[PDB]
Amino acid sequence: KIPRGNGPYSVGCTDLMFDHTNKGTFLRLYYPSQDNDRLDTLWIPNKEYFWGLSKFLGTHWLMGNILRLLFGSMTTPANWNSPLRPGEKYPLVVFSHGLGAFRTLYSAIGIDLASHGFIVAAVEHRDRSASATYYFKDQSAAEIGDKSWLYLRTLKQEEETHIRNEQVRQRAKECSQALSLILDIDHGKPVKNALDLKFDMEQLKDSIDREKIAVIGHSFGGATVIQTLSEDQRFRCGIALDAWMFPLGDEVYSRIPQPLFFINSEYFQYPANIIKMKKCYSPDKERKMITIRGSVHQNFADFTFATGKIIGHMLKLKGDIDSNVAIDLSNKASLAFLQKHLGLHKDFDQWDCLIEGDDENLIPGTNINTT
Ligand SMILES: Cc1ccc(N)cc1-c1ccccc1Cl
Ligand SMILES: [Ca+2]
Ligand SMILES: [Cl-]
Incomplete structure (x- = not known):
């Protein structure tokens, strides 16, 4: 088990994708929650992440199917789509995952921060450093949930210095862009989440301590x-x-x-x-x-x-x-x-x-x- 948060707040969790493209922001949000009786959050929510993980581990893509068999129903202790706890402005952490990882794999950190009264936006990077990630090719694809998957890129020795630096630079841009997205949601910008989830983003209006x-x-x-x-x-x-x-x-x-x-x-x-x-x-x-x-x-x-x-x-x-x-x-x-x-x-x-x-x-x- 991934541990529960040590802080006094109950923890909620949801996913945010805006816009729907490979250049948009994709993040998992951990946040102080109003309620504590929702279903726990699914840890790795799609089979393609398991395929990506097995490619990153250097194994059979079918070894991914065994990882899915073992870990595909694992949850993490955050209330899925719980209402945001009202009446408080929260400091914001943007969190960046490691090589071969993705947005969901640092919930022990994200939940603990949320239980102490932070909002945590764990970005999913589209620089091909994630094991897997996904996005939609256009608005049509987004509507019907036709996902395009993007898998970890392996490098030749001669590509190492240059490509790792291009990726860290895109990673930083994706962090700033995720900040701007949350800050615009806080300041009331209407945002249609590319994912059809039962968490209304209008809750995040006037909820960010904008200096913190x-x-x-x-x-x-x-x-x-x-x-x-x-x-x-x-x-x-x-x-x-x-x-x-x-x-x-x-x-x-x-x-x-x-x-x-x-x-x-x-x-x-x-x-x-x-x-x-x-x-x-x-x-x-x-x-x-x-x-x-x-x-x-x-x-x-x-x-x-x-x-x-x-x-x-x-x-x-x-x-x-x-x-x-x-x-x-x-x-x-x-x-x-x-x-x-x-x-x-x-x-x-x-x-x-x-x-x-x-x-x-x-x-x-x-x-x-x-x-
Ligand atoms: C089995 C394994 C080995 C090495 C790393 N880095 C990760 C894993 C893994 C993958 C998916 C789900 C659970 C685990 Cl433990
Ligand atoms: Ca800048
Ligand atoms: Cl080590």
């Missing part, structure tokens, strides 16, 4: 954090979860005025990556870095909760640390940082010690020696 915006992301999504902050000053801080720094252009590093928090796994990180993170540092800038002891790269994604301990450890979905313990550290440390740099009037400063890596399962800064 952050960008969060894992791996390729952590590079997306940094690119996004450098090009869109509407985002006031960013949290990079085990960022994979390779996609970033050399120009970006001296161009991040916003506060930036690195939360790293112990076993993923390496000198070339840490060096790149340290290039984001300068004395006028707010930077923080922590490492979770005993953790692996996948500790930030929902796959860490999808299997048992032995199979978990074998597939590198779990580390030596307990998955609930690790995500609690990452989510609590993130809440304290967001309180500090967004100016929230909550009680998230109870976790200020974690921003400093002060906990028996935290390393201050990094374990990686770059000297």
